[PDB]
Design a protein around this ligand. Sequence first.
Ligand SMILES: Nc1ncnc2c1ncn2[C@@H]1O[C@H](COP(=O)(O)OP(=O)(O)O)[C@@H](O)[C@H]1O
Ligand SMILES: [Mg+2]
Lengths: 526, 525, 529
Amino acid sequence: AKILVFDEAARRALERGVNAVANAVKVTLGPRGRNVVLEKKFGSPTITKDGVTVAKEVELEDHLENIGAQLLKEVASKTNDVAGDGTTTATVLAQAIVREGLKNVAAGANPLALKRGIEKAVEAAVEKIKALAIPVEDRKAIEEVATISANDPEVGKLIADAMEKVGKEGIITVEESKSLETELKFVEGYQFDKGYISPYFVTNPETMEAVLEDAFILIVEKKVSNVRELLPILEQVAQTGKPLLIIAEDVEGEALATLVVNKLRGTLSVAAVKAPGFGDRRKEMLKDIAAVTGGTVISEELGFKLENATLSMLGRAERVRITKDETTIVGGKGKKEDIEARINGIKKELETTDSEYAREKLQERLAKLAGGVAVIRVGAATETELKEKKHRFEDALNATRAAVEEGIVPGGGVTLLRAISAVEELIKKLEGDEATGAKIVRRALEEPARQIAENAGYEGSVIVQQILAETKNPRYGFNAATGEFVDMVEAGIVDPAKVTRSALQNAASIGALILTTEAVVAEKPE
Amino acid sequence: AKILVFDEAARRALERGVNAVANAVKVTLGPRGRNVVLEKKFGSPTITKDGVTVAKEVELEDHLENIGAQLLKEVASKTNDVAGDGTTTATVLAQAIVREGLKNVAAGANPLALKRGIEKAVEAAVEKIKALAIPVEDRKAIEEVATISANDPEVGKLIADAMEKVGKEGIITVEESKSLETELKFVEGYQFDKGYISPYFVTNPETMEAVLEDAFILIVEKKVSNVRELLPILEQVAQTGKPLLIIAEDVEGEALATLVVNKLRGTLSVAAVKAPGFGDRRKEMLKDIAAVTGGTVISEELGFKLENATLSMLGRAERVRITKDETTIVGGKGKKEDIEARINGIKKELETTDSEYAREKLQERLAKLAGGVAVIRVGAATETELKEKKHRFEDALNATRAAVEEGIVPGGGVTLLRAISAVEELIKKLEGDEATGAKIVRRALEEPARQIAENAGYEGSVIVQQILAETKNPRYGFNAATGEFVDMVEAGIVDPAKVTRSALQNAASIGALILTTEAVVAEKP
Amino acid sequence: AKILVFDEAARRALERGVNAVANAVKVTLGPRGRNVVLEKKFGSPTITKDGVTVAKEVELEDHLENIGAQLLKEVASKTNDVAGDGTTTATVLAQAIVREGLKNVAAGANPLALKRGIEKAVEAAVEKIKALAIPVEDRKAIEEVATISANDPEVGKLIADAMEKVGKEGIITVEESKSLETELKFVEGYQFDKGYISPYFVTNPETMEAVLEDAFILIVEKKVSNVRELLPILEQVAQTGKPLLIIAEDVEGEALATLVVNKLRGTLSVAAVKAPGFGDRRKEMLKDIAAVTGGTVISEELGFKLENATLSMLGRAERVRITKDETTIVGGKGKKEDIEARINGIKKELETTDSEYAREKLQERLAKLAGGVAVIRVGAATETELKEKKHRFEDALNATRAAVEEGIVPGGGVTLLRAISAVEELIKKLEGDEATGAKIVRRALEEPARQIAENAGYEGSVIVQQILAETKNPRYGFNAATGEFVDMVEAGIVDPAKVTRSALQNAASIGALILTTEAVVAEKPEKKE
Ligand SMILES: Nc1ncnc2c1ncn2[C@@H]1O[C@H](COP(=O)(O)OP(=O)(O)O)[C@@H](O)[C@H]1O
Ligand SMILES: [Mg+2]
């Protein structure tokens, strides 16, 4: 029992959703976001100033409107997913683009033409972001960036060192130490891009992660779907009192169902994750895990049933962190020999490799194993003070890492504003509805800056003007925090150019999507 | 299926909740609070005059409005949590601040500016509370304070003595004696800031505590989540007929589930508490416990499984008291040797220590082990009369202890009133909406005093005036109890300056929060 | 049936209404202002840019909110009454004063004091307006005032042209032309809207006119129906060989039949035309006609018999045109002193006339007598366009009038911005809420300048700052039409000091009142929930 909806009817419904999210989220953008209250079904209410936190809690009653909300949240988040920030900024830009877009379409503008224009606009914008970016590759550079985003010259050093040694494609993590001091330690471990097969395996509802400490790592290679072939090992581990991380190529049917039940029951704290990589590439990576873990790849190939698996064929580590997009293994306890075994065998095969693509990938396995897993044990005094430093340091890390990828640009929306000039120049060479699109982007670009100042209790439009007024130094901007105009850079208010380029491109993507939408097939109230 | 709400729509909703609580609560403020009737689903109705009692029972049907009520209750209670009182007073102040705040915001005032001013106002107010605070450090001082908060000159003495000997950073506890007399004894024991992992471990529903007498103290270091590795020791202790206190770094899954079931079942009376401190700091404190208890830290480090734990590796004490925020061990039966062993090894490492922070903390461990554990065995006659004295004396203690940290000020709202002048001076240097905020706080400050007189059946505004009239002695105030103006201090109507400073700062926090609220995402019915 | 609303509840409601109207209006303010579309009961709608016109159409469903809407309308109209222009400006200033003020009331300020301060602040403001006023002294100065008020160069031109060739004491009229084009035309001699009492009088068959060259004017107050009384003069004239125009309350019966027959005969060339006005004014006008032609009025109440009339007491003119409904006496031979004394009798009488209607009647007389009557016939392709184009002319005139009266000041709200420094100085001498009151005006004074710039696509606050910034030459302002800061006066962006002063005084009058509200007694929403 579906329900069809076409043309403006549909686009307007989606927009409604888009606005629901965007309006709740943008009140937090900038140094002085406003408070958003979220109520928990059981616990008492919560108050935030974090866009992502609020975005997660936004779900609308109406199917069609919700579809828009979800659709926005998705594309918006895939910004934080590649730069660890700017998910809220992408939402704001998107709202604007959607609004003006639908307005002009309703006034007779051609959707496709608007799109062609919105795209050309963004290109020009991005190109300005680039030519405006400050590279961060020096030692001092990387440290300073992190030092700021963390607000701790020490953690800055650590983050810098951690990167210095593990490398760009290396592994770095922030762990909640128990000690009251923050230190940097280079343990053994691995990390691949796969996450919990079921959101029920989550340990912490807030962070949406599944944290396992001192657990076994059952490394399978088959599709574990039968309970009978799993109960044996599941039992041995049950009596161990320890948690279990399953890394099969997939866990479905009974298998996955059981794992989830006992997990939510308290019988056994587990978490299933799909095997890293694909094809030949995968078994090779499953071994990399067994090596650093001290377990063995239970492959049906070398003939071996699961039920006959010993509570010793499965390696283990000090801590395992599972995200919906990534699995991390800290404290690998495999034989330092097996590990160096892969590292070398990987280098040998690296000389025999000819395709640049294959090379880069062996490179990452090489950098994961070697260098290992730079860990930043975070010291606190309160469970509270910890969550704080934990978050702060973690972000500072993601920030800095992104910062290195695409340089940095002036923050506080200022970079997006400087992009306007580039869009203006484009418009002068454009005409028709296409030019209108370019104009739409140009208007959008003002929102972030404006919204920040606005949230801070200032006249958005006014500040945005005074900023665009200064043409001398493009780094000239408004620091909504102190309420003064300064050099955003020299004021330590910067953003990973990667984050900005993304938020924009993503927002513009959602916009183009909706303008090009001619129908939506939703589910009728079940 | 959520439900968004923005701008004034939201703020007004929250305010509705804020008022629901506040209006039910404030009718109890002061020496003559009015009666509030609360019905119990099963038992017959209840009547109170206690703000906190009433606040707990306030839950609204509307999600949005309730959100406000809960939000208030939280911030309001985190005053009683740091001073053991003034939760109701913080509520009243908050109601006022929220009202005037929203009013002026609706008239076009800038929220942030109002905040900036509400803040500056509080500062100046607090600063006056301080400069007006009565220090409690004398012998008579500390005794009198406690004597009052306990309503027992004897317990006052004991509390005074207990503090006199164990010291500021020392350990003091109130235990439910079996004797019909109240005494002070200086045993052996420990105490850390961690409570029952599950509210189901509670022994007394009223006091919300978990009291275990002559129990074993299974000191673990791993995350006990498996039943198999716990059943062995759980069984040995089960046949002992004695209770058990588990102090692992955490108890979850099956382990925590089983412990709770048998507890509520009657199979085994236990209670799980998380391990004190964090990190290296923690294992060091887990040993301090084993030392005073006569047990051993079951650490997987020194290689040792839990199932193989003997009913002798776990020390024991005469009584263990568990609160949702604190665990107390009275009657430590560890070898007097193992104890003095930590005391000295702690002093040696204390000379090698250089960071002032690390020092102060070894200081508390040092004061916990040494001085010991001043215990106040509480004598009663009824299980009822006991819970009462228990609570009363315990609060009196916490009150007095806090009273020593930050001095005392005139009660009956009078101190808050004296803060007005400070706010006035501030306003004269302020302008715009910022000045308005300051004015909001200034108006709020009158509520407590006013409300008290009101509840007592007098003209609030009138009394509040006659008080602000006298400029000579700031301790001049109205005693709603006798219906006469007197020296609040010399009249024994004082308040821990810490309590007051908190209630204000907290209320003003809720206020600023709501004014800065632009949206709320609630769950649909 | 009533509902009693107090405190903030009441003020907010009122404010909602105030803003409802004000925001519909402000959309028009300035050169880049746009139009509002007012639905009419039957025909096409009204498409204006005029404050009061829009304001008057606004009617809110909620009683309290509506009361607010009304109070604001009053500000609009009373300003239109006192100056005919600057209604939008007054609305904006009122809105501004109401919000900034209502805020302060919520903050605990005493409204009464706020009022006193507002009042004092306005006085100081007005005084500064006068202080910057420049007297209108030439064709340019006027072309400017008009071009602006109408927001059209062309309109400003014709108004200047006409105004010039009709003197500042003249009279200009706006009429509905028939072609697509607008035309400016002057009325030569004395003329009134009465035509030939009988089509037979016609002289030209191609123009349906009655042209009498060098003729005698017979001015009879009473009617005329009896042939007898006429014959004596008709013979005297007939023998003169000259044409004759007879002006009497009416010419009927055998008396008219005579003139016609003789006319058609060739006996005597004549034409009859009813008296100009009515009541005592056509009596006073006949005399006007008298003084202009030179003849004598056969005043039935001065003691004159038509039968005893003489060529000695007849009016004489160089020419006479009579259309189906209009009469024009060209080249009247009247005595100069008779005219002037006839004129200065109206002047030395206007200075005692109140009802603006009586001042308009006693003005078209003094206009005719000064042969100074211009008329702009506005053309357009559609009724809707025309009705607005027509209106713009009317506003431009009202402006011009006011400009001549109290002077001219720099436009674009610039002049009111300059009033700020005055209120500022005043504040330094004020205390308490009274000082707050003054501050309210201080802020309000920016609204006009802001909204103009705003509706043009600029930052209100920004522009107002740069203006208030350069304090060397008060004539410094922003040209919201070109987007450049300039000397407002030199740029030709000026406003009649009268409208400015009025707008503010009216805005401030209602505004302050509102701030003193503490209760409202309205109708309980009839059958609603
Ligand atoms: N080009 C211009 N630049 C700056 N101000 C202008 C310009 N044209 C008109 N104005 C100003 O706009 C104002 C009011 O315009 P208008 O829309 O006609 O409303 P109102 O009913 O108040 O007269 C005046 O102060 C006038 O001088
Ligand atoms: Mg006008």
